[PDB]
Amino acid sequence: GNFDLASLAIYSFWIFLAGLIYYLQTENMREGYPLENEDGTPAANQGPFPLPKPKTFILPHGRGTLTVPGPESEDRPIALARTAVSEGFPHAPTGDPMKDGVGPASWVARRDLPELDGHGHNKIKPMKAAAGFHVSAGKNPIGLPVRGCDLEIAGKVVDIWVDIPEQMARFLEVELKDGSTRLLPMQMVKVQSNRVHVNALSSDLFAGIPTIKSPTEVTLLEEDKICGYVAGGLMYAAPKRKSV
């Protein structure tokens, strides 16, 4: 230092970068904190960063607001139990982890409404109800039989559910043997020339994919259950996954 301008500037920069990191870390604590013990009570050691002052997001289309930080709560039962007498070990599913939605089958209790676009219309629609939408490039999946990782057919593709504002494919709607349908995340299927293959699930697990309560829209809560369930099969359908 310090009767030199470059020295004053670099010293000042470090002070600023320390404040910036502090600010950035506290901004990143608007969700998930305070830290909890494994029983859900507040942990003793919160760290040296305090919770920031809340901010409020005004949500569009009369959906209200979100104020964070606020009271954290799962708003759903978690079918898991301890496997050790001390902290830091896994928690074993107490039933079927795919049905109970724990582990990599986990879902969050998002709003039970669909995501809306800029004009207040449902963001995701079956292509059949999406005026003017059509497949523009690539193999069209509609009509292909759907194969699970047990190398067995679980059903047939009956539509693509599309993101209207982003003009992209988000799910395949798949008809099962009983005539009902399910949604499969597009990120979890492989469209092949003569089939759609689903590595994550064996055929017998398709029935258990969480259903949507109205056939022409999907809610944020429903997306989370479907995507959770399908992801969970990488781990939990592993015994039925023939080598490939």
Partner: protein
Amino acid sequence: ALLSFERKYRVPGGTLVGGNLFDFWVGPFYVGFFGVATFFFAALGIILIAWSAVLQGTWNPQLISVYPPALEYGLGGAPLAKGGLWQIITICATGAFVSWALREVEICRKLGIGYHIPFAFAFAILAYLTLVLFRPVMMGAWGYAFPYGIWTHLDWVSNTGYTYGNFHYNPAHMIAISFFFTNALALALHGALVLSAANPEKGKEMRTPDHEDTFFRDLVGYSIGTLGIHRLGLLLSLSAVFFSALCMIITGTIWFDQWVDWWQWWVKLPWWANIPGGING
């Protein structure tokens, strides 16, 4: 302690080695077999560095430096005091980084996510390995790798560059620079865009990704979209490192003269080589 939403995801399984033997956390950190491997390699690494400090006669971290074996050693081993420590520390480094990548894979499996992170990370490891392993192997000596020291490695960068004139003239290096600057451009833009939608003018409602496409279309006539932009950032930054690896793997090996002179191939193409005027005639 756990995040408010964490418990449901801390289930058994996903490990690559050891079954349940290491399927546990220490505070926030997942361990696993590769957690134990990472600790072992890092720890042995840091202790060897600390010991190299002793042999150097300093404990200052702006001064501590571990140099590789001198070029006379070729690709054999060197005494600990004189390059040996560097060689074992490089093995520990490699073991730590790869162990860290594989631990990341175990974490992905437990969480049911894609493997894109450890895959991205593997480009950094490869860049490191180019400089300390592939390039030295291909040039015939460990002496060509960089020393491990905060400033001494910067000297290596400068001395290595000026060995080939102004290193700017490395064409793979120009591409790499371009991806780095473009990646930083995409990062500013992406952060600013999402925050501008999440944080609108005072009193107004959060904007929508439709607002994010509109902003960019109004502005430059194109929007890559929200899946697009994350694909882009991943491509830009991985491409930056790939070309970095490339620009060095070729320097000292296929090209070793002054980089400016490489551009003569274009200038001397026969259809214009002899046409007078210009800078080169």
